Paper text:
GH29 α-l-fucosidases catalyze the hydrolysis of terminal α-l-fucosidic linkages. GH29 α-l-fucosidases process their substrate with overall retention of configuration at the anomeric center of the cleaved fucopyranose and do so through a double-displacement mechanism. In this mechanism, first proposed by Koshland,, SN2 displacement of the aglycon (activated through protonation by the general acid/base residue) by nucleophilic attack of the catalytic nucleophile yields a fucosyl-enzyme intermediate, which is subsequently hydrolyzed to yield α-l-fucopyranose together with the released aglycon. Crystallographic analysis on bacterial α-l-fucosidase confirms that the ABPs act by covalent modification of the active site nucleophile.
The crystal structures of α-l-fucosidase from Bacteroides thetaiotaomicron in complex with compound 4 and 5 provide strong evidence for the covalent binding of cyclophellitol aziridine to active α-l-fucosidases and by this virtue the validity of the cyclophellitol aziridine design for activity-based profiling of retaining glycosidases that employ the Koshland double displacement mechanism. “Aglycon” here reflects the aziridine N-acyl moiety to which the BODIPY tags are grafted in ABPs 1 and 2 and which is designed to occupy the space normally occupied by the substrate fucoside. The 3-D fold of BtFuc2970, however, appears not to provide sufficient space to accommodate an extended aryl aglycon pendant to the atom, which would equate to the ring oxygen in fucose. N-Benzoyl aziridine 4, bearing a bulky aromatic N-benzoate group, is about eight-fold less active compared to its N-acetylated counterpart, 5.
Author numbering: 35 to 479
């Protein structure tokens, strides 16, 4: 039992309506947009395979010369209403936007630095326009914010002298100033998702992370803050030295989701995964043939996976320099939206069902105790195994899309075969189960 001033604050999951909304949303989109979209992974003739948003680093570009990319920031095809229509049609209930990435360029007209949209040919407050457009479509907006900033000389990677400490202190002042600014210009913000918080400097300043969390919660009622922000008194990040989760939800699982058999611990807190369509490209990269690019079904599989274990999933997009989306991303959003329109009752506002994982796919649980079977892998046996928790029985099964009744055969105490539909749906599909919890056997139902 280690005593701590800047360790965890929340007892269990938050159950206030704004957290319920953050959670019930389930499906988000990420936007990574900034100066990196101009060179798109290429610099001085060399195409770099690393993440396009890190190209300043891959190509060893000095800050002064990286930031002169602002002179070419002119996204004439940008239209925030079109971006919000795209998100709505994909079935997202929220969008997270890079307000400022590591390069330090701000997508709003910050009064605290010259490296902003204000000082580009385009001049306009892109951040404000997107906030309005998404909110007009009924889509919540979350702000990604990089603490690490390659544009501000005051930033330190570690505190190695009194000078470093004085310097980093003003940098933290500067960071609070931008945070207050985003919270006061854009009060409909629902979440701040921090990044670039892993350096020794930040870990040494745990108190500052707790302060930022508190500051923003005073400024924006109900606002959510990701675990990635937080370091405790010992420099321990995400979960404090007593294993307790800091911030409002766990953020991680980029490129590997929690294991549905081994990582059931995650159902005990709120959490959010974010993913890329290629293997590791968040900002726009001009050449997607360099790594594996996920198909719509592989993405939909990850989204349902997340919801089945009590978490959110956010699919990333890296808009072109011009303010439009490349065709792969338009195809992806469309394909996702088509499936979500059909099967979304087993994703939106669903949660962990407390059933043993089976091979055919994933269970999710609705707000009224519906139990959905989302089938990704069709058994040649024509039978979907359903093993129930103690005291739970399956009274009915129904194909979601048509309401057709589906046979359920009991095979042992607590196990059934649910038949596959008479006609193969030809895509990942949903069977809704009606279940009954027996009088006073303890269970989550």
């Amino acid at each position: 039992e280690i005593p701590l001033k800047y360790g965890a604050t929340n007892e269990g999951k938050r159950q206030d309506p704004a957290m319920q909304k953050f959670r019930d949303n389930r499906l988000g989109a990420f936007i990574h947009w900034g100066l990196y979209a101009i060179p798109g992974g290429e610099w001085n003739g060399k195409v770099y395979g690393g993440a396009a948003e890190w190209l300043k680093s891959w190509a060893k570009v000095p800050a002064d010369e990286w930031l002169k990319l602002m002179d070419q920031w002119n996204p004439t095809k940008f239209d925030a209403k079109k971006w919000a229509k795209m998100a709505k049609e994909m079935g997202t209930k929220y969008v997270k936007i890079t307000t400022k990435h590591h390069e330090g360029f701000c997508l709003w007209p910050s009064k605290y630095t010259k490296y902003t949209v204000a000082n580009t040919p385009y001049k306009r407050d892109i951040l404000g326009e997107l906030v309005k457009a998404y909110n007009d479509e009924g889509i919540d907006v979350h702000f990604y914010f990089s603490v690490m900033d390659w544009s501000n000389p005051d930033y330190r990677y570690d505190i190695k002298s009194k000078e470093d400490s004085i310097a980093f202190s003003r940098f933290l002042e500067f960071t609070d100033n931008q945070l207050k600014e985003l919270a006061t210009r854009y009060p409909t913000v629902k979440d701040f998702w921090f990044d670039g918080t892993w350096d020794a400097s930040v870990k040494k300043n745990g108190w500052w992370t707790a302060h930022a969390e508190q500051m923003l919660k005073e400024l924006v009622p109900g606002v959510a803050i990701n675990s990635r922000l937080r370091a405790d008194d010992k420099g321990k990040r995400h979960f404090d030295s007593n294993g307790r989760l800091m911030g409002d939800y766990e953020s991680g699982y980029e490129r590997r989701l929690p294991d549905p058999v081994k990582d059931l611990k995650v159902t005990q807190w709120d959490w959010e995964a974010c993913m890329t369509i290629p293997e590791n490209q968040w900002g726009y990269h001009k050449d997607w043939s360099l790594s594996y690019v996920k198909t719509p079904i592989e993405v939909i599989d990850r989204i349902v996976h997340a919801v089945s274990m009590g978490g959110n999933m956010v699919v990333n997009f890296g808009p072109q320099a011009d303010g439009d989306f490349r065709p792969e991303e338009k195809a992806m959003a469309t394909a996702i939206g088509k499936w979500m329109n059909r099967y979304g009752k087993a994703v939106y506002a669903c949660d962990y069902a407390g059933f043993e994982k089976q091979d055919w796919g994933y269970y999710t649980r609705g707000k009224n105790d519906e139990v959905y079977m989302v089938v990704f892998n069709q058994p040649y046996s024509e039978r979907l195994i359903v093993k129930t928790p103690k005291g739970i029985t399956v009274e009915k099964a129904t194909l979601l899309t048509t309401g057709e009744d589906i046979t359920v055969v009991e095979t042992t105490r607590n196990e059934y075969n649910v038949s596959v539909p008479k006609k193969n749906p030809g895509e990942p599909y949903v069977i809704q189960l009606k279940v009954r919890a027996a009088k006073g056997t303890k269970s989550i139902y």
